[PDB]
Amino acid sequence: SLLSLPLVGSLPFLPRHGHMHNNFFKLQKKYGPIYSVRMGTKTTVIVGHHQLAKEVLIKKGKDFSGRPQMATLDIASNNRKGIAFADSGAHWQLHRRLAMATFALFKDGDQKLEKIICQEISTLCDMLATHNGQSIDISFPVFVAVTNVISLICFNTSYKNGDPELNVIQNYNEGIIDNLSKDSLVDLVPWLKIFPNKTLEKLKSHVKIRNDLLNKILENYKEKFRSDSITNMLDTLMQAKMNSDSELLSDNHILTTIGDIFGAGVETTTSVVKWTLAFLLHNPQVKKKLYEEIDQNVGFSRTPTISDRNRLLLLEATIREVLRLRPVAPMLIPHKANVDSSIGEFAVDKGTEVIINLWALHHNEKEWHQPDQFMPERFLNPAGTQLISPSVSYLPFGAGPRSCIGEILARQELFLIMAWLLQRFDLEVPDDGQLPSLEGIPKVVFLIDSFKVKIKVRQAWREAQA
Numbered sequence: 001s002l003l004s005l006p007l008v009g010s011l012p013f014l015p016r017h018g019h020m021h022n023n024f025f026k027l028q029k030k031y032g033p034i035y036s037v038r039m040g041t042k043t044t045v046i047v048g049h050h051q052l053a054k055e056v057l058i059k060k061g062k063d064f065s066g067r068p069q070m071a072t073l074d075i076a077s078n079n080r081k082g083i084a085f086a087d088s089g090a091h092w093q094l095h096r097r098l099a100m101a102t103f104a105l106f107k108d109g110d111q112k113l114e115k116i117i118c119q120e121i122s123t124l125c126d127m128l129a130t131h132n133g134q135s136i137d138i139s140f141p142v143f144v145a146v147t148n149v150i151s152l153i154c155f156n157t158s159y160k161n162g163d164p165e166l167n168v169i170q171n172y173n174e175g176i177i178d179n180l181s182k183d184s185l186v187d188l189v190p191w192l193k194i195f196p197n198k199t200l201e202k203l204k205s206h207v208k209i210r211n212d213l214l215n216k217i218l219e220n221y222k223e224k225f226r227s228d229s230i231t232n233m234l235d236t237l238m239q240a241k242m243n244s245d246s247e248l249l250s251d252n253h254i255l256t257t258i259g260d261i262f263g264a265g266v267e268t269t270t271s272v273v274k275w276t277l278a279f280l281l282h283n284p285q286v287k288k289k290l291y292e293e294i295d296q297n298v299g300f301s302r303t304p305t306i307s308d309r310n311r312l313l314l315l316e317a318t319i320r321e322v323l324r325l326r327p328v329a330p331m332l333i334p335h336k337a338n339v340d341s342s343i344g345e346f347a348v349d350k351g352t353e354v355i356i357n358l359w360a361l362h363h364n365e366k367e368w369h370q371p372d373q374f375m376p377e378r379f380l381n382p383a384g385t386q387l388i389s390p391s392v393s394y395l396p397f398g399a400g401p402r403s404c405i406g407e408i409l410a411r412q413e414l415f416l417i418m419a420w421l422l423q424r425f426d427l428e429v430p431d432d433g434q435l436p437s438l439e440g441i442p443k444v445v446f447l448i449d450s451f452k453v454k455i456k457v458r459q460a461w462r463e464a465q466a
């Protein structure tokens, strides 16, 4: 005969316990593949089935192409300018098209995308070879390689070995990623609006070093820009300013688009490489089969080529399986409803935040055989002769208006970095028994805990030098 306590708030699970993308997933067993949460006035919908996800991303793509406003993303994007964190509208559509246009320039020519990548990988494999017999963290060497690539794609410039500017870029990259969000971008409770903290203070300072550095590059480039030479992204963006839309192509607009491209080009790829090495250290059977495949298909007469993706199918599968088990963005980047719409015939109102739980799509037990397993074989027919698409619930690069604009660069960097390393190096467990933790660290990107790997030059790659 006792009364029930008045309830002021309620959340499905504890905050800051487990990974958000996995807590939403576990929650589907209670409430289904689509449900909503209310935080004050803000409403958020989480979608964990491929059918509903393809509706949000593709079929109704234009309706759910907005980006919500976050205090941190404002600072990082210079008030919602750029591509990734910009709302759907004039700025985003223009710059995304220009950035996409830039990548199209890299069909075979004097700067074929493969040759830029290979030029930097040869330097990487040379540096790593000097550590023959030692255990090292490959974060920075790989960071340098991909930084020089995207730097060439953006400014036709690279960094000389040992340039301190690289160490400066790494510093503010780790600083922004750290403070851009505690754990995932999706944050149930707005902790930084509640308690006194220094998060935005710290974030602004790392953004100042980033903005100042890029502002130096841009100003210097106004002197080198010639309209008759459009070979990099900064040319494309400047070429567009003159033609005018000039209010959409100010210096601050160009700054952020380069920042978005510059940032995503180094951190996403560096992360996926580290993830792949981690899985290969936990699966020596796979790693052994990858050496055999590359020995019988590429050998040592030459270095790997992008065409070799026709031969090295277990490698393409491995990369596919990593992008599945540990997606770079397990919950994509939050979407926002631009207008009143629906998902699964449920109503969704304008301004409502919408998150696609890609982690749920890649771990759904009905669409995948033993989804929590690392099985690159699942992307190959039973004969290991050609690649397959075993499930329709697989969107490593997203889909629709907001899909990845650098997917091409990503797949090529990943395939070539892994191909060059496997040809030349034995990548074994360090002298201490430590294996990397495959748990992961959910940030704006799904990072892996730093770890060491014992690198040795392969006996076969050596004998082939006589």
Ligand code: HEM
Pocket: 057, 083, 084, 085, 096, 260, 261, 262, 264, 265, 266, 268, 269, 272, 323, 327, 328, 329, 332, 333, 334, 396, 397, 398, 399, 401, 402, 403, 404, 405, 406, 407, 409, 410
């Ligand atoms: C393995 C590497 C990568 C993976 C798995 C990946 C995947 C993704 C995903 C899931 C999204 C969000 C999709 C959505 O919000 O619906 C995205 C967006 C984006 N990606 Fe990537 N990406 C990778 C690398 C790159 C690279 C190398 C670039 C180079 C420029 C890049 C640039 C972008 C940008 C700018 C966006 C936001 C576009 C927009 O908001 O319209 N990404 N990517």
Ligand SMILES: C[C@]12CC[C@H](O)CC1=C(C(N)=O)C[C@@H]1[C@@H]2CC[C@]2(C)C(c3cccnc3)=CC[C@@H]12
Pocket: 076, 077, 084, 085, 172, 173, 174, 176, 177, 180, 210, 259, 260, 261, 263, 264, 267, 268, 328, 329, 404, 444, 445
């Ligand atoms: C966080 C980071 C990297 C660190 C840099 O100092 C600041 C930064 C970006 C920036 N505003 O300069 C763009 C972000 C990128 C991280 C990757 C991001 C979030 C990204 C992305 C995330 C996941 C998959 N594909 C692309 C789109 C925008 C990119």
